[PDB]
Amino acid sequence: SHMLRPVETPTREIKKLDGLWAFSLDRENCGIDQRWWESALQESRAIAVPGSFNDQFADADIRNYAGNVWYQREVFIPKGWAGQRIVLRFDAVTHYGKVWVNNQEVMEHQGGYTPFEADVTPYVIAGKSVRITVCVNNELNWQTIPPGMVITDENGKKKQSYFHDFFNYAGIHRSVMLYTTPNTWVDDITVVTHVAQDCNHASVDWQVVANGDVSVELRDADQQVVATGQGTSGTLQVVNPHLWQPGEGYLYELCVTAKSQTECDIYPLRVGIRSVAVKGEQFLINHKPFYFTGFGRHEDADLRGKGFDNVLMVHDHALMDWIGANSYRTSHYPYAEEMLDWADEHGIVVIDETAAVGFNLSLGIGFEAGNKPKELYSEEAVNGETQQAHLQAIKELIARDKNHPSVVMWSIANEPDTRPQGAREYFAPLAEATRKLDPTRPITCVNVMFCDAHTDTISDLFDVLCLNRYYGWYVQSGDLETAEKVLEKELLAWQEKLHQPIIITEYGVDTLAGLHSMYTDMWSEEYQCAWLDMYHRVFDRVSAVVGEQVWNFADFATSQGILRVGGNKKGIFTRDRKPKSAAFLLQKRWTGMNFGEKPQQGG
Amino acid sequence: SHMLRPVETPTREIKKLDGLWAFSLDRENCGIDQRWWESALQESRAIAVPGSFNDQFADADIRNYAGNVWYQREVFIPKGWAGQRIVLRFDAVTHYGKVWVNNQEVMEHQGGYTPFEADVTPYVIAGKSVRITVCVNNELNWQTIPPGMVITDENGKKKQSYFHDFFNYAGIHRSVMLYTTPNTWVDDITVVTHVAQDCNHASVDWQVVANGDVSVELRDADQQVVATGQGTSGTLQVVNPHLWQPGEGYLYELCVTAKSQTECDIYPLRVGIRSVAVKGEQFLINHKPFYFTGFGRHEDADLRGKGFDNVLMVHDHALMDWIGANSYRTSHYPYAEEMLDWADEHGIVVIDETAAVGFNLSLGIGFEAGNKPKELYSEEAVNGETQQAHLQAIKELIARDKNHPSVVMWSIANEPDTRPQGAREYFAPLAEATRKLDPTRPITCVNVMFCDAHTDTISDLFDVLCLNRYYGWYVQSGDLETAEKVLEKELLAWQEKLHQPIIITEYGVDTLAGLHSMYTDMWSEEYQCAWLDMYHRVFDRVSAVVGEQVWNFADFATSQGILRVGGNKKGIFTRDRKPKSAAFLLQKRWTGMNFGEKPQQGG
Ligand SMILES: COc1cccc(NC(=S)N(CCO)Cc2cc3cc(C)c(C)cc3[nH]c2=O)c1
Numbered sequence A, B: 001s002h003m004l005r006p007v008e009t010p011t012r013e014i015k016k017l018d019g020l021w022a023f024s025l026d027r028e029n030c031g032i033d034q035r036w037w038e039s040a041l042q043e044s045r046a047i048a049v050p051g052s053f054n055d056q057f058a059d060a061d062i063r064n065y066a067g068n069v070w071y072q073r074e075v076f077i078p079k080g081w082a083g084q085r086i087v088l089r090f091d092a093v094t095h096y097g098k099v100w101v102n103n104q105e106v107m108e109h110q111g112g113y114t115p116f117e118a119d120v121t122p123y124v125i126a127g128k129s130v131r132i133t134v135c136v137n138n139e140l141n142w143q144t145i146p147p148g149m150v151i152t153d154e155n156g157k158k159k160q161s162y163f164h165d166f167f168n169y170a171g172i173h174r175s176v177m178l179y180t181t182p183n184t185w186v187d188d189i190t191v192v193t194h195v196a197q198d199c200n201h202a203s204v205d206w207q208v209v210a211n212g213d214v215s216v217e218l219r220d221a222d223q224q225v226v227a228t229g230q231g232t233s234g235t236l237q238v239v240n241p242h243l244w245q246p247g248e249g250y251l252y253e254l255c256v257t258a259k260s261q262t263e264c265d266i267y268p269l270r271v272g273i274r275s276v277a278v279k280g281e282q283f284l285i286n287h288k289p290f291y292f293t294g295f296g297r298h299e300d301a302d303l304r305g306k307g308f309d310n311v312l313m314v315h316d317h318a319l320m321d322w323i324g325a326n327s328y329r330t331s332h333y334p335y336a337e338e339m340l341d342w343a344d345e346h347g348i349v350v351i352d353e354t355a356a357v358g359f360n361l362s363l364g365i366g367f368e369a370g371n372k373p374k375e376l377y378s379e380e381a382v383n384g385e386t387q388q389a390h391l392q393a394i395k396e397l398i399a400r401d402k403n404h405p406s407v408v409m410w411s412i413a414n415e416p417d418t419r420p421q422g423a424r425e426y427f428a429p430l431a432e433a434t435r436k437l438d439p440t441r442p443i444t445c446v447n448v449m450f451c452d453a454h455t456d457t458i459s460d461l462f463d464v465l466c467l468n469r470y471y472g473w474y475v476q477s478g479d480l481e482t483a484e485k486v487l488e489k490e491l492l493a494w495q496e497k498l499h500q501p502i503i504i505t506e507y508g509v510d511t512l513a514g515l516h517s518m519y520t521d522m523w524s525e526e527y528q529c530a531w532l533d534m535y536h537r538v539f540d541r542v543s544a545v546v547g548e549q550v551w552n553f554a555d556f557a558t559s560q561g562i563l564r565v566g567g568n569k570k571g572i573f574t575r576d577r578k579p580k581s582a583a584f585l586l587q588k589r590w591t592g593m594n595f596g597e598k599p600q601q602g603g
């Protein structure tokens, strides 16, 4: 369906993020049968929203729980909301939600990183209290967007396994809200900026609408009406403009009016005049040779999970700004939109990514019981549904982020195994369909190191080359000397194979803060520094390398294992954001360069 | 008396350092009355020598023990030792030892950092076993060289307090040995190298001798006899030579022969042709403008105490060599001679220091019960004995180290309070007497920051200016900005006051390895780096500054207190010798310079 980011004019919101809700586990899965949502959850306790449920209670049994949990809370609908449109919206519900307003089932959602909403006017009465009950599921299976497998034990209980690193946080991770609309209402919008050698340029509106006529007006930074359009379906305004750029990120505001003889609906959609596409081995934003810096990130932090948080947000960006990141990627799931609004506002370049992670079964590291399906693409394991579920996941992200100028690229998935058979048959359609959803931006699929330049059957189908590489770490462990060869050899081997522009979307080594070594070896701070030094030395000797993003901005939490010391320790910063000695090395390189500019194959 | 470093030709040793001795505490102090040394200590256990007794057992009760402890062990005297001179030697016994060979009291010593020996021939029989019993005392009082105070509690037990930082380790910290001499024997030697504008030069022998005639011969590096002298009392040989220098440290060997008609005694005394003295604001070794780098060190390490250790020794020097130290100081006590032999051999410059530390009562940091004597120099507190005990401590160090070329300076004490009254009356005699013991080297007394350039009543009496300064740390805590002013202001204020050459013998900040901060504040690694940066920026803007030695090479152990987090954390390295991020900053500065060379008031 249609997603529009709420803002506040002929519409206003009660955020329900007001944190404390009633909470409970349903270890018997008797909750739907016993119709829990008709009265107050019993045996509950306070929980905060937004945040993951897992770590709020310091309890392993809750942390590793799998199945359904219940959220409940009450809330007076504002008196002024008349006969108006009342709309309940969740920015995310991690993995799956079902919603009961008093007794009315109003909503259902699968996907954990994108919004869903419903018109609730008929079971609500403005000026009165209404119960809100949410049922939340955190289970993953094969047609799910990260896939996974729930093993039920003989003894009654579930237990989740899956194929990615990062830990399976679940819950209401983002803002909920009740919001208000006129019965005339904008409900969809799309916008495209074309650029021309940097002198002048044009933007297209298209806009689905609740019944009404659209006056479309584009405003200055200073609110001077410099673009006007008529029509409820389409326009193009060719004004000679001020562009969205990386150092600075200028933005226009396109108000959107939908009219009836009774009503009016007014919408400001921030807009960045920017063009994105690839030319040969170059990446082009406003027809310029960019160079990417920054990291893969996660939504992870002590206590809250992947739960959204303003302070955290403000601090991390301060940190990225300081250290010279111009860009980052939404590692392995759609992030809360606020990050993107900030990126636009601040001109930060974003490779936007779907939750399609862990399609891979070789990854890995198993001393344990094998199964585990034999064929990756099978009706058993990655199947028809799964391509369809996956398709739907790509719609939504694009539905949400097409209008965010900061997004210069889409990412279809991260590290799928492309050595098994259906791997090109699975990936070709979605690659086509992606561009049929948005042809304004290039599209990639992020590449695991064992589908290497001679074995990977999928890369031509995409526009840019996104590599995750560990050459001294998982292989050649500890050996910078031979690691540098393999890496360059393999970067050159990609350059000729595909003659595409190359970005390393993951390069990094586990490092324990405070571990220091005169022998400069694995897990030491010094080693991280030497290893990043080297990867760097090597992108300076390759023309096709136009992007660099460090494995992890900060240490995050993982599934429990032998290869993870209390989590992934590959952060430049610790989880509480204290900088490892490598923050200061990246500091120099990233602020020493010219903005958006590769070195002189040296410096 | 006379000290000569054993080496092995007409003399040979059984080191008795063979570690495991029998050990016990004497909590009743009934040990001498009950004549423990007549039979095997009872209720004993194995202990290793050399090492401190305190930490070998992981026991707090033994670690904090005060009083007498007993060492005992047996050892066959070598058959070949005939009617020869048999000589028992201890390189150190920390604080005080008394020694019983079977029942014969052979020895007594107060001082913990210098050798003492005795002729044991008459109570020993070559080819047989003999008991060795040592009584060791670790108590400090006012006439002791570090001074201190033992409070006996009402309940029966002692408890030591004292006035220095470093922890009161005690025990047999260095090699013991039985050694052999002919009845003709060299027993004393002294040597002085004069240098002349770098073309040619002369060395004086003087030598006390067991009865016999001395042939004195100086050899090449390659054992070619290039200097010869006759006389059992004095010579000078003027040969045109190859000098002892800091980068490289060349050495000659002067054999020493003492003759009888029955016997011959042969002694090689390594000799470095080098001149040391001050000229104006310059420090001169072989008439050159030196610049000092390196640290204050301690004899401290996990498990062993201040006990000597070859591996430790080899590793630390590797570390100093790597990081650019050309020099160091024997912080607050005479070190094991092996360090000095190594320094000569490797050309490393050494400010040699006595155990005279803690003369100061203002230092400090007391929330607790005051007393504590009112007048520092009094018959109560630092008194006539104390100047005499102190005098004796200076003899011995000079007795031991006069022949070590690596020692370019003597240090009389460290951080005494010179604001109370007797402070110039106490210090003037020893300053005079020092030069009457060795006029070949300059002499200093190390200066605490609160006897500052306007208040310190003692500095003219010495040759070089040795300052310990903490300007952002103990005062101006955390404030590099104002700390830099005070420091420079106070360095200039010294330069004019005395127009002597200045060395900072202590500059450093407590730093926890692994503590990282974006705010670059106290106890963080980054702070240490900024603070050392700054002290440095400031010696580059002062002409009189010709020496820099970092507070601590590595973290050491201290007395328990509120200001010490498991010890002094001011090491560039942790106690297990892992480098803090500041090892790499000092690295650059120390190897970036020209050898022995201050920068161009810049670089
Ligand atoms: C199931 O969730 C978990 C749990 C714990 C660890 C991981 N590891 C992950 S995601 N990575 C991917 C790094 O981008 C490490 C990894 C690399 C790897 C490389 C090669 C060349 C081979 C042959 C096998 C490999 N196996 C691996 O596991 C995943």
Ligand SMILES: COc1cccc(NC(=S)N(CCO)Cc2cc3cc(C)c(C)cc3[nH]c2=O)c1
Residues within 6 Å of the ligand: B162, B163, B164, B165, B362, B363, B364, B365, B449, B450, B468, B474, B475, B506, B559, B561, B563, B564
């Ligand atoms: C008794 O054994 C201990 C136990 C614990 C700590 C110490 N501290 C020592 S030796 N230092 C000397 C540093 O070279 C720190 C120290 C500095 C200081 C400076 C000023 C200006 C004043 C007024 C008072 C001060 N007091 C101090 O204690 C000694």
